[PDB]
């Protein structure tokens, strides 16, 4: 049952992130681009040019030893 509780809790958080303020959706929009560009791009001028267009793809990458 615990995976189901963690399901429903992760399902509510997705609604809460899709419903926040207009000043915070465009604040998390920019530091995501910057975060991906410094932590993972490292001068590869394609990957920056992908992260600027699409920063949710920049936010969706972790480091290696986080797992999952």
- Partner touching 53 among ligand PEB, other proteins, a copy of itself, none, CB below 5 to 8 Å by kind: other proteins
- Partner touching 15 among other proteins, a copy of itself, ligand PEB, none, CB below 5 to 8 Å by kind: a copy of itself
CA atoms in the 13 A half-sphere facing the CB of 1? 0
Rounded to a whole number of angstroms, the minimum distance from the CB of residue 26 to other proteins is: 19
Read out DSSP for 41-58?
Answer: ITT-HHHHHHHTT-HHHH
Are the C-beta atoms of residues 55 and 29 closer than 8 Å to each other?
A: yes
Q: Which of 16, 18, 46, 63 binds ligand PEB (CB under 6 A)?
A: 46
């Amino acid at each position: 049952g615990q995976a189901e509780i963690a399901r429903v809790s992760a399902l509510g958080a997705a609604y809460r992130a899709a419903s926040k303020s207009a000043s915070a959706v465009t604040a998390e929009r920019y530091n995501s681009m910057a975060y991906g560009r410094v932590h993972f791009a490292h001068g590869c001028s394609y990957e920056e040019q992908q992260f600027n267009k699409y920063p949710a793809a920049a936010a969706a990458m972790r480091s290696d030893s986080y797992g999952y």
